[PDB]
Amino acid sequence: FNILLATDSYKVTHYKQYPPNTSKVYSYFECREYEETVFYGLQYILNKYLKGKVVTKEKIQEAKDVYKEHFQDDVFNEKGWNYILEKYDGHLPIEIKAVPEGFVIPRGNVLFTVENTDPECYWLTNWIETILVQSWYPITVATNSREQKKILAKYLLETSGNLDGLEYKLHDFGYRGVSSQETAGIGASAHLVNFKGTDTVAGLALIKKYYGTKDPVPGYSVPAAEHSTITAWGKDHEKDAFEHIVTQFSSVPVSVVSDSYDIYNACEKIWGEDLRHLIVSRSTQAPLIIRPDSGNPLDTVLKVLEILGKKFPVTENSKGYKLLPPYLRVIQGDGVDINTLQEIVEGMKQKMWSIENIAFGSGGGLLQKLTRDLLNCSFKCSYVVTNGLGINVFKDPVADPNKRSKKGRLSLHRTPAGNFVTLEEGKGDLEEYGQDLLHTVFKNGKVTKSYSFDEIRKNAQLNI
Amino acid sequence: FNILLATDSYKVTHYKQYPPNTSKVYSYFECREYEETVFYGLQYILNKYLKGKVVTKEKIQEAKDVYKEHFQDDVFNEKGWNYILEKYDGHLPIEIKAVPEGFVIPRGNVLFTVENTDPECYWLTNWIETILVQSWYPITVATNSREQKKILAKYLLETSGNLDGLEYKLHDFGYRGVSSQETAGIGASAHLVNFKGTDTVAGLALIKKYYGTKDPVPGYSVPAAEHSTITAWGKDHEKDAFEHIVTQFSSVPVSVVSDSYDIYNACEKIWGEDLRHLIVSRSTQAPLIIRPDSGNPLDTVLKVLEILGKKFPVTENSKGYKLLPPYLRVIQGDGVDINTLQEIVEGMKQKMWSIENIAFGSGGGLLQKLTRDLLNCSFKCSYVVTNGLGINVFKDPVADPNKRSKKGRLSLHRTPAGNFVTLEEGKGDLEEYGQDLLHTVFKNGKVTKSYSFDEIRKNAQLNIE
Numbered sequence: 001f002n003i004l005l006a007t008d009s010y011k012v013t014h015y016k017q018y019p020p021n022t023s024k025v026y027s028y029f030e031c032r033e034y035e036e037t038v039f040y041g042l043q044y045i046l047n048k049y050l051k052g053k054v055v056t057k058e059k060i061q062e063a064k065d066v067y068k069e070h071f072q073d074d075v076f077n078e079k080g081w082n083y084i085l086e087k088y089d090g091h092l093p094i095e096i097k098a099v100p101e102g103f104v105i106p107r108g109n110v111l112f113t114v115e116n117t118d119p120e121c122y123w124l125t126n127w128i129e130t131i132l133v134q135s136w137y138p139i140t141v142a143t144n145s146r147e148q149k150k151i152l153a154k155y156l157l158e159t160s161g162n163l164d165g166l167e168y169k170l171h172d173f174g175y176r177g178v179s180s181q182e183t184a185g186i187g188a189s190a191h192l193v194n195f196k197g198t199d200t201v202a203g204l205a206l207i208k209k210y211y212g213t214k215d216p217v218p219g220y221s222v223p224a225a226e227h228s229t230i231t232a233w234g235k236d237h238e239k240d241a242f243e244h245i246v247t248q249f250s251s252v253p254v255s256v257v258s259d260s261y262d263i264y265n266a267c268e269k270i271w272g273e274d275l276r277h278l279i280v281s282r283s284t285q286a287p288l289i290i291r292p293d294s295g296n297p298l299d300t301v302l303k304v305l306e307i308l309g310k311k312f313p314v315t316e317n318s319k320g321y322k323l324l325p326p327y328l329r330v331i332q333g334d335g336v337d338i339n340t341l342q343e344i345v346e347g348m349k350q351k352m353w354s355i356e357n358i359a360f361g362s363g364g365g366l367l368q369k370l371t372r373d374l375l376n377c378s379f380k381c382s383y384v385v386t387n388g389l390g391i392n393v394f395k396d397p398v399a400d401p402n403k404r405s406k407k408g409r410l411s412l413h414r415t416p417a418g419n420f421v422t423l424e425e426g427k428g429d430l431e432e433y434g435q436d437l438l439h440t441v442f443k444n445g446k447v448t449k450s451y452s453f454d455e456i457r458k459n460a461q462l463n464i
Numbered sequence: 465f466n467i468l469l470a471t472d473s474y475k476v477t478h479y480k481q482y483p484p485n486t487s488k489v490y491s492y493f494e495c496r497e498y499e500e501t502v503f504y505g506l507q508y509i510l511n512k513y514l515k516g517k518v519v520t521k522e523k524i525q526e527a528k529d530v531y532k533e534h535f536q537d538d539v540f541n542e543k544g545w546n547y548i549l550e551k552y553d554g555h556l557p558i559e560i561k562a563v564p565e566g567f568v569i570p571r572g573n574v575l576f577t578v579e580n581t582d583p584e585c586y587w588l589t590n591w592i593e594t595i596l597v598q599s600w601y602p603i604t605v606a607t608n609s610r611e612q613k614k615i616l617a618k619y620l621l622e623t624s625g626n627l628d629g630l631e632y633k634l635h636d637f638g639y640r641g642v643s644s645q646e647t648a649g650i651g652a653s654a655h656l657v658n659f660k661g662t663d664t665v666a667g668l669a670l671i672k673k674y675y676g677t678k679d680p681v682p683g684y685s686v687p688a689a690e691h692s693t694i695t696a697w698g699k700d701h702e703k704d705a706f707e708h709i710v711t712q713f714s715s716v717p718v719s720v721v722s723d724s725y726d727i728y729n730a731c732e733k734i735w736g737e738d739l740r741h742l743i744v745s746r747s748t749q750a751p752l753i754i755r756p757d758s759g760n761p762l763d764t765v766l767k768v769l770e771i772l773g774k775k776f777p778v779t780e781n782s783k784g785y786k787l788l789p790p791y792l793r794v795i796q797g798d799g800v801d802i803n804t805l806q807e808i809v810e811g812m813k814q815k816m817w818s819i820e821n822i823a824f825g826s827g828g829g830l831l832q833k834l835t836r837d838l839l840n841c842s843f844k845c846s847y848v849v850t851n852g853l854g855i856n857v858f859k860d861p862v863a864d865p866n867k868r869s870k871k872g873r874l875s876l877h878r879t880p881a882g883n884f885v886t887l888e889e890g891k892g893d894l895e896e897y898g899q900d901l902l903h904t905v906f907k908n909g910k911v912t913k914s915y916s917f918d919e920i921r922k923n924a925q926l927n928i929e
């Protein structure tokens with residue numbers, strides 16, 4: 001990895017565009033204007049890409065040769081990069097202050113600030129915008145996953161007496177549906193801020209390396225079938241496949257995809273009749289989890305529950321909701337996103353089925369179908385010092401007041417009512433709102449403050 | 465990187481689930497029935513993750529330790545992985561056949577197939593499904609980028625009579641808007657299959673390392689401002705900022721973001737009056753490229769062109785469309801996706817503005833706002849050998865006929881009319897169609913066939929002339 005080649009091309013030309021004699025460029029990140037966001041992922045970026053010796057003579061030469069061909073011109077700041085290499089042993093003279101990871105903050109607040117610590121490196125602040133703005137992704141995955149946790153908690157509380165098993169109710173199925181191996185690890189780790197169930201193995205190693213947990217692993221899974229393991233037996237042998245799989249995993253929970261040919265026949269005739277003796281004999285710690293994977297998600301879930309309810313002994317909870325026996329559960333892992341999850345739990349509640357009967361698997365909906373526009377994650381310059389005079393800088397486009405940015409030196413505070421406020425124009429210097437909530441997390445090539453994954457999870461907890 | 469830890473967790477348990485006495489598991493990838501897709505990205509995956517010694521005693525031990533805690537159980541095929549390590553020096557006994565990269569294939573056709581070459585490794589075919597299915601991303605980016613090139617080509621030909629500059633008309637602005645550094649490189653490389661303009665520097669190194677070009681670089685850019693380089697001068701000094709920047713880059717094209725405070729004032733009064741003398745003196749090879757970045761994308765483009773048309777000399781080309789002077793152009797780099805791109809070029813055509821006046825910059829629309837669902841990229845088992853007997857396997861869910869998968873051994877052929885057909889149930893073995901278009905690209909840990917990036921670009925070319 002070469003940080004000199006890890007920016008938007010036009011940033012290579014910016015050192016020539018700032019006002020002459022600029023000694024300081026100060027910038028910030030916010031989720032402009034999903035009312036609250038989970039701040040997560042900056043520590044990964046700081047450790048993997050920004051800390052230590054990130055500049056070498058070879059990296060400078062490599063960048064110089066690439067940019068000369070890419071621009072068909074010599075515009076690369078070889079002198080500027082050589083200065084960092086010689087003066088600081090290739091360590092970045094930058095200071096980053098950030099809100100603690102896992103913190104849940106309302107939209108429109110400063111989340112982190114960046115500034116150069118050497119006047120010669122005024123151009124460095126925004127060079128690293130590209131790599132830091134990629135924080136949008138773990139922030140957005142963690143926020144969207146926590147918003148789904150709120151729906152699940154609300155319905156699980158209403159339909160049962162409690163929140164038992166909430167941490168396992170939304171399982172990450174997103175490994176194949178993301179854009180890369182690196183994205184799979186980042187996104188799966190962001191989902192693990194809120195839940196404990198994942199099939200995206202890449203998330204485990206990232207948490208272990210960059211954050212750390214008291215427990216050996218941050219996420220868990222159970223044995224499960226896929227269409228190839230059912231269909232490989234042949235169309236007329238679906239029962240044989242099911243019998244083999246549940247006998248192989250007789251003492252652990254086992255998820256079995258049941259829609260290869262006819263989900264309704266599989267539930268009523270195969271599970272409900274032919275193999276019923278192998279299911280009713282299972283332990284409460286080893287249920288069969290039936291997996292539909294096609295059709296209208298709500299209609300399919302309700303019909304599967306009706307079928308199972310007529311074949312297996314159903315009880316009524318203390319809240320008056322129907323409950324399958326403890327050796328039998330369902331997982332809906334097709335077409336699940338925050339909208340369909342809400343439609344399904346509401347549809348189940350209206351048909352008097354407890355949410356303890358169901359779990360959800362989400363792939364693309366959880367990890368891929370997200371963009372930087374969802375939370376309006378943005379990085380902007382708010383303060384510069386030119387000719388030794390500090391000026392409050394901002395954009396304010398005529399046609400879009402939503403794109404207006406903050407002015408001057410920023411700080412995050414607690415209001416008298418305990419809410420959050422971002423003070424602009426260095427107003428935090430007046431001791432009216434107490435102490436700034438942002439902490440220095442990076443300074444001059446070193447990570448100065450870090451958080452464990454257990455601390456992040458505690459910070460990200462729901463009030464409920 | 466550890467391939468034993470690079471699969472969906474449940475795949476760790478599948479070796480115990482397949483029918484006993486299974487010696488072959490054969491699977492395929494298709495973009496299930498954007499009528500045609502660009503096949504691109506498999507070569508990256510083969511080289512980075514699948515080739516050579518991918519199994520070591522240390523990787524087996526690390527996997528075993530993680531899975532014991534992840535499952536709270538000892539389900540992990542240690543014998544199976546040790547076998548590959550001992551018999552094959554950790555090289556995968558898999559054969560992958562694929563259509564050549566850059567090939568444009570209608571939907572619902574086999575694009576690649578995977579099978580184990582050793583009977584003991586029947587479980588390995590689908591172990592690597594997760595890693596191979598990630599090819600959905602470069603295929604989708606390249607396809608969606610090509611569909612935008614079709615729109616631009618149609619409108620550029622209609623309003624100007626030629627395709628000059630088409631390859632620089634859609635610039636990649638997506639580096640910050642993607643989910644990771646790895647995604648940035650893959651996605652940027654996929655867009656470069658169709659165009660030559662990028663700011664996502666990451667794509668250059670990926671192409672150089674995994675594909676290669678005769679030219680020193682596959683993508684190009686020009687100097688451009690950002691809001692920080694304009695706003696840093698202060699609100700009352702936007703004209704000074706503009707003046708400094710166009711003077712610094714007087715001999716090359718320069719893009720200047722002009723909406724920091726009031727895009728319309730910047731166009732009419734700053735560029736159009738105060739600094740007009742610095743614009744009209746510029747070379748045809750060094751235009752000023754005005755960049756709006758807010759407001760309704762179509763209304764803004766149209767209003768910017770109407771302002772510039774009243775401040776600068778406008779000509780009428782041979783097609784009857786208005787053309788700004790050659791030293792002045794516009795780039796719309798906000799809210800651009802395939803739908804808004806079509807809306808802007810149609811809107812411009814209705815107002816009699818040539819498409820030679822505009823370029824587009826696309827970020828999230830080009831590289832992030834895409835999912836595996838767009839082309840229904842899917843990997844499924846179609847053939848198995850159990851007790852020495854080959855059986856055609858498939859799924860066919862009652863509630864969704866669109867999720868039905870293909871049966872048996874597959875092959876891809878040219879039809880007599882020059883279209884494509886996927887033959888199922890090993891029917892390709894009859895010599896009724898020409899040669900199978902799928903070629904072996906990987907076998908037993910070796911990449912057996914590679915394509916250069918120049919070959920991929922040629923294969924992905926549009927028909928237009």
Ligand SMILES: CC(C)C(=O)N1CCC(c2ccc(NC(=O)n3cc4ccncc4c3)cc2)CC1
Nearest residue numbers: 168171173199222224255287329331359472474
């Ligand atoms: C009370 C209990 C039964 C409960 O609610 N639990 C919550 C749910 C939990 C669970 C259920 C299923 C799966 N895996 C699958 O169904 N797979 C993994 C996949 C990955 C990718 N594509 C498809 C997949 C199918 C894992 C954990 C068991 C405990």
Ligand SMILES: CC(C)C(=O)N1CCC(c2ccc(NC(=O)n3cc4ccncc4c3)cc2)CC1
Nearest residue numbers: 008010632635637663686688717719793795823
């Ligand atoms: C006829 C000529 C003028 C033409 O059509 N060309 C096609 C367009 C080409 C070009 C125009 C602009 C930019 N870059 C920018 O505007 N930047 C890069 C960014 C990256 C991320 N975010 C915001 C950005 C703003 C690069 C190349 C010049 C030649």
